[PDB]
Amino acid sequence: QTVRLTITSRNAKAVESVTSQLLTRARDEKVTIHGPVRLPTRTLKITTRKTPCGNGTNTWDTFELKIYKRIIDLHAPTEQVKKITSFTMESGVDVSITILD
Amino acid sequence: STYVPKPSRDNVYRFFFTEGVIACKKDRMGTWTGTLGGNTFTVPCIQVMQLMRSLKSRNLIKEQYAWRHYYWTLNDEGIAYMRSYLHLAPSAMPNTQKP
Amino acid sequence: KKKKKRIFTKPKKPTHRHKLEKMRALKYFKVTENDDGSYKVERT
Amino acid sequence: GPLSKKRMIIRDGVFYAELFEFLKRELAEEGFSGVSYHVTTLRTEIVIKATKTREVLGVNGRRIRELTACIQQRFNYKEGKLQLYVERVEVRGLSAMAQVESLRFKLLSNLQVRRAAMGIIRYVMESGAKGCEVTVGGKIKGQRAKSMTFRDGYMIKSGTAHKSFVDSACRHCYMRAGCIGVKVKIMLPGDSTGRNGPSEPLPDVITVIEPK
Amino acid sequence: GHLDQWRSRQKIGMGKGARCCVICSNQKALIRKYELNVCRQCFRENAEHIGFTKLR
RNA sequence: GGAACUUUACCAGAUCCGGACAGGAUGAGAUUGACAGAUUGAGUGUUCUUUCUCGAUUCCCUGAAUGGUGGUGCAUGGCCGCUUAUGGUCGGUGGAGUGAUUUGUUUGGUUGAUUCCGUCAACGGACGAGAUCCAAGCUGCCCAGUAGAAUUCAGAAUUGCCCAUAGGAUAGCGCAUUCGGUCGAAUUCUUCUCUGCGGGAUUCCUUUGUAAUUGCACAAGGUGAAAUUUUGGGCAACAGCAGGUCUGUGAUGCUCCUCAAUGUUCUGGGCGACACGCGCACUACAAUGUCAGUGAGAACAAGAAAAACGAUCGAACCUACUUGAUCAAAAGAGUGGGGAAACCCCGGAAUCACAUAGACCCACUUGGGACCGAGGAUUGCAAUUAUUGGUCGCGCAACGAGGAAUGUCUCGUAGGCGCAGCUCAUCAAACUGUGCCGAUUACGUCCCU
Numbered sequence A: 001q002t003v004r005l006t007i008t009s010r011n012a013k014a015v016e017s018v019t020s021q022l023l024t025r026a027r028d029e030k031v032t033i034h035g036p037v038r039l040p041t042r043t044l045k046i047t048t049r050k051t052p053c054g055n056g057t058n059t060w061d062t063f064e065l066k067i068y069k070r071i072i073d074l075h076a077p078t079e080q081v082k083k084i085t086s087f088t089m090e091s092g093v094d095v096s097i098t099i100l101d
Numbered sequence B: 001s002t003y004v005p006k007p008s009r010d011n012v013y014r015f016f017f018t019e020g021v022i023a024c025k026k027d028r029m030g031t032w033t034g035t036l037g038g039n040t041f042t043v044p045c046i047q048v049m050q051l052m053r054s055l056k057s058r059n060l061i062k063e064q065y066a067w068r069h070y071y072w073t074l075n076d077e078g079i080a081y082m083r084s085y086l087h088l089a090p091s092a093m094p095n096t097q098k099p
Numbered sequence C: 001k002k003k004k005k006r007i008f009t010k011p012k013k014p015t016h017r018h019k020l021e022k023m024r025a026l027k028y029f030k031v032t033e034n035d036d037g038s039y040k041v042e043r044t
Numbered sequence D: 001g002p003l004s005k006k007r008m009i010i011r012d013g014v015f016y017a018e019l020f021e022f023l024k025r026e027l028a029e030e031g032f033s034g035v036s037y038h039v040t041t042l043r044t045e046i047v048i049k050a051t052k053t054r055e056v057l058g059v060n061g062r063r064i065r066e067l068t069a070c071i072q073q074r075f076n077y078k079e080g081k082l083q084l085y086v087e088r089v090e091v092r093g094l095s096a097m098a099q100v101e102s103l104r105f106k107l108l109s110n111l112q113v114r115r116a117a118m119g120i121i122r123y124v125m126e127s128g129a130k131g132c133e134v135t136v137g138g139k140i141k142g143q144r145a146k147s148m149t150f151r152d153g154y155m156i157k158s159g160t161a162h163k164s165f166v167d168s169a170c171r172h173c174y175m176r177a178g179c180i181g182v183k184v185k186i187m188l189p190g191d192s193t194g195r196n197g198p199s200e201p202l203p204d205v206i207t208v209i210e211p212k
Numbered sequence E: 001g002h003l004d005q006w007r008s009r010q011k012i013g014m015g016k017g018a019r020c021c022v023i024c025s026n027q028k029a030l031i032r033k034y035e036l037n038v039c040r041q042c043f044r045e046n047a048e049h050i051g052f053t054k055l056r
Numbered sequence F: 001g002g003a004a005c006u007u008u009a010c011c012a013g014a015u016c017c018g019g020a021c022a023g024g025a026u027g028a029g030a031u032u033g034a035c036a037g038a039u040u041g042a043g044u045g046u047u048c049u050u051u052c053u054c055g056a057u058u059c060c061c062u063g064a065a066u067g068g069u070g071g072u073g074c075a076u077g078g079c080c081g082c083u084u085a086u087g088g089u090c091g092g093u094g095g096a097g098u099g100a101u102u103u104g105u106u107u108g109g110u111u112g113a114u115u116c117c118g119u120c121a122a123c124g125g126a127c128g129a130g131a132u133c134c135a136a137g138c139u140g141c142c143c144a145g146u147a148g149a150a151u152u153c154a155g156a157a158u159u160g161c162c163c164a165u166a167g168g169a170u171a172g173c174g175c176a177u178u179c180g181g182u183c184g185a186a187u188u189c190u191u192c193u194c195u196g197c198g199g200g201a202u203u204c205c206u207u208u209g210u211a212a213u214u215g216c217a218c219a220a221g222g223u224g225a226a227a228u229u230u231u232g233g234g235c236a237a238c239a240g241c242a243g244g245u246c247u248g249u250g251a252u253g254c255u256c257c258u259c260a261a262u263g264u265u266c267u268g269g270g271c272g273a274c275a276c277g278c279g280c281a282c283u284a285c286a287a288u289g290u291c292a293g294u295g296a297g298a299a300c301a302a303g304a305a306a307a308a309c310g311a312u313c314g315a316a317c318c319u320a321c322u323u324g325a326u327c328a329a330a331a332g333a334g335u336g337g338g339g340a341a342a343c344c345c346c347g348g349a350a351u352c353a354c355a356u357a358g359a360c361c362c363a364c365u366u367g368g369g370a371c372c373g374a375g376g377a378u379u380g381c382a383a384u385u386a387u388u389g390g391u392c393g394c395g396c397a398a399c400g401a402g403g404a405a406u407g408u409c410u411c412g413u414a415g416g417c418g419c420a421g422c423u424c425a426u427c428a429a430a431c432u433g434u435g436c437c438g439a440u441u442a443c444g445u446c447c448c449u
C-alpha cells in the first residue's frame, strides 16, 4: 500500500524543515520513498486602496500570501507511517495523511 | 422581542453559573445555544443581551467586546447573586473557580 | 437632521391598555349545589 | 466537503487575528506581548506572552480559566480540545507592546508627557536596545493638537529590513479632552540565537574577519 | 402582528444589507474574496495578522 | 460609490424600545400575545369593538441611561494624500559671532544621489540615498501515479499511374509516415513543466578613447542569458499643510436628538429625474475595410456552508459531456467530475493568418449602430422608470478624421487585442492584474512649465 503525506504551510522555512524531518525519519525505516514533490506555490492577492476615505492620488496596496505544498509517498503500513509522523511539528504546518489506491 | 420568559432566564442563569463566562454574537436576528450539561437549550440572542445588560448595570458581571462577540464574566458579586437566585448550596463554584 | 415641527393630520393613536377582568377565572366554572351539601363544578 | 488549501489558510489567519484582538483588549492592563498556538490532533495549546504573568493567571488560575471559557464558547471548542498557557517575556524592555502599554498607563494616571516618554526611552535603552523612539500626539496643551517625538540611539526606517529589526506598537489613550495616540519603536539588538533579535546582522553592514 | 413585520426584509438575507464586516460590522466595501468578509479598511490594519505581507 | 428592495445617510407615512438601572405609585392579576369585524397602503391586535391567552419577564413618572452614516476633520486619535522624486535632514564636542545664527553640510571634478575623490576649524556620529526585500530573464541540486518525454511490442489508417475550373511560389530525395479513444501494454528516463535553498554581473576585461596629470570616474567594444541602480516594483528621512476622512470600526472630546425619536424596523418613492456646461471613458467615421467561411493558437486567475436544515456525509459554487433535436437562438433538463498542477484542461481568447481562385467597390454604402416597435426566455420576495441575454424589424441618428486648446509615453515600451479577478442573486463602457500582436522617434536641451 502507498501512503501519501501532504505538507502545507504559510512559512517556507517551516515547510522545508518538516518535510526534511519526515524524509530523514522515513529513511531510518528503510521504506521506499517517492521523493518530496514541490507542488506549485500559490499566491493569494488582495489589492486595496491605501486611503480609508477616497481622497488624493489613488494609491494601492498589494497584499500577497504564499502557500507552500509538499507531498511524500510512503510504501509502509499505516502503523509504521503513523509513528514516522509522530514528532513535534513546527507551528503553522499542517500534515495530512491519505491512503492511495 | 426582549420579553424574556422566566424559564429562559433561569436556564441562562444556570449556564452562567456553571461555566463562569458567556460568549454571544452581536446580532439582533440570531440564536444562542447553551449546553447546560445534558441536552441543549437555545435562547434568542436579543434576549441574552437583554439579560446581561441588567447584570452589567447592577455591577454583577464584567463585559468585553471584540469582533462582533460579547464576553460576559461573573464577578464575586455576580457569583454570590447567582448562588442566591438559584438557591445553590453554599460553597458551590463555577467551573473556572472549581479546582 | 433636525426637528421640523411635524404637524399631524390624523389624531394621535392611543396605546393599547390590557383591560383587566376582575376575577376572570371566577366565571369559567359553575358551582352547582349538590344534594349532599357540597357543590359541583364544571368547565363553561 | 473538505475546505480547499486556500480557504483553510485564510480561515487559520482570520482565527489568529480575532484571538489576537480579544487578548489585546482583555489583557491590556497586563503586559500582553503576543500569542502563539499549535494545533495538534488532540489539543490546540494557545500560549500567551505577558510581562505581569501572575495577574493573567489569577488566583489558582481563575483568570486563565475564564479566558479558556471565552475562547471555548466563541470558537466551539470541544471539552479537552483547548489548553491555554502563559509564559513571561524574557526581556520586557525589548517589547514594544509592553512599553506602549506601560506608557498608556502612565499617561492615564495624569503624568507629564515629557517625563513619561523619557522614562520609557531610558528603560528601553537600559535593556540593551540599540535605539528607541516614542511619539505622543493629541491635545496635550490646549485646544490645538501637537505631536511630540523623543528618540535615542539607532533607528532604520527604509527598506524591508526594518520590519525585523524594529519592534513597533501603537495605542489609543482616552483622556478627558479627547484621544491621545502613543507609539513606541524599539531597535532590537542582534541575538545569535534569534530569540529576541533577528540573528542576522544589518543588511548594509560588512565585517572583515580578523586573520588567525 | 408587529413581530412578523419586524426585520422582515433583513430575514430574506439577500444583497449588501445582509453582509457585513466580521470585525467592524460595517456593510460598506466588503472584501468577499476567499470568503474573508472583511472591510477594506479593517483588512489593512489586520493584513499582517491574517498572514498577508506587503511585498511589491 | 456598477444604489431595483436591503444598502440609504434623502422624501411621504406607519410600527418597535433595542429608556439598562435607581427611587416612587399600581400589582396573583403588574403585563405579553392574539381569531373575527374596521381602522389601514397593509389575510399590519398599529389601534378600536369583542374575548381569550401569557404571567411578575413588564408596564405607569421622576431622574438617568442608551443608540445615531446627527453637527464640528477649525477640538482629536489612526490612516492616507500632498509639499517632494527629487537628494535631502539633525545632534554632541570644538572653532567663529553681543546676538539671532554660522561652521561641520563649503568649493573643483564625478554620480540619479549630501554618490564618491580631493580639499578644508573642524572632528566624531545619526537618518535618508545605497544596501535589504518581492517579482522577471540564465543556471545548480532536488522532484514527480496532481509534470512530461523517448524507445520497444502488439492494434488499426494512408500507400504512387494519378497534375484542380486558371493551380504559381515554398525544406527533404540500413529502415516511408500517421492514430492524446488504440481511454493496448511494457520498459527506461528528466530535454521541456513544478521549486526550497544556491550559482550568475562587477565597470570584470580591452583602448595608443575621454579624463587623471593623484584620484573618483566616463564613453565605445569584448565577455555573456543579462552590460550598467540588470529590468520592474515595494520600502523610504527631517520639517510641514488648520489638505481628506467624526459616511470603516465597540477609534474619540464637546455638542444635538432621544418614545408620533435624527434611535430602529416596515411599505412606497428618491439617490437614475433634463433647455444646459464640464472631466474621464466606450463606439465610430470604413477597402491597412465590413461581412460569410476556414486555419493555427496565450497567460494571470477563480470555484460548494452554520452549534442551521435533511439522512459521519449531501445540498448550495464552478464546470465537462449528453440531452433538448423527428428542426431558430437564448433556454430548459439528465449524468459525471473537481477543495483546484488532479475536474474544467491537450485551458481551440481576440488582434492575426488563408493561392477562401467567396460577396461588396467609394457610397452616409453591406461604413456607423444611436433611437425605437413586437414576440419570447432568464435572475430575483419584487423588473413599471426598458435588471440582463436572445430573435425579427427600425437604421432615411449624428458621424466622411474634428477650431482655439490639451493628456500620456523611450522597448517587449506606445498603440492595438482580448482574458481573468474584483464589485456580483442578476448587471462592466470601471478598476486591479494577465498574456498576445508589436512600432515611429530621441539617446538630447534648459526655450516653455
Ligand SMILES: [K+]
Binding pocket: F239
Ligand atoms: K524640506
Ligand SMILES: [K+]
Binding pocket: F446
Ligand atoms: K528650464
Ligand SMILES: [Mg+2]
Binding pocket: D158, D159
Ligand atoms: Mg532604497
Ligand SMILES: [Mg+2]
Binding pocket: F002
Ligand atoms: Mg445597478
Ligand SMILES: [Mg+2]
Binding pocket: none
Ligand atoms: Mg426603505
Ligand SMILES: [Mg+2]
Binding pocket: none
Ligand atoms: Mg433604496
Ligand SMILES: [Mg+2]
Binding pocket: C016, F045
Ligand atoms: Mg399591540
Ligand SMILES: [Mg+2]
Binding pocket: none
Ligand atoms: Mg438611522
Ligand SMILES: [Mg+2]
Binding pocket: F073, F242
Ligand atoms: Mg486637517
Ligand SMILES: [Mg+2]
Binding pocket: none
Ligand atoms: Mg487627521
Ligand SMILES: [Mg+2]
Binding pocket: none
Ligand atoms: Mg557651539
Ligand SMILES: [Mg+2]
Binding pocket: none
Ligand atoms: Mg555645533
Ligand SMILES: [Mg+2]
Binding pocket: F105
Ligand atoms: Mg549648517
Ligand SMILES: [Mg+2]
Binding pocket: none
Ligand atoms: Mg550628471
Ligand SMILES: [Mg+2]
Binding pocket: none
Ligand atoms: Mg554633488
Ligand SMILES: [Mg+2]
Binding pocket: none
Ligand atoms: Mg511627516
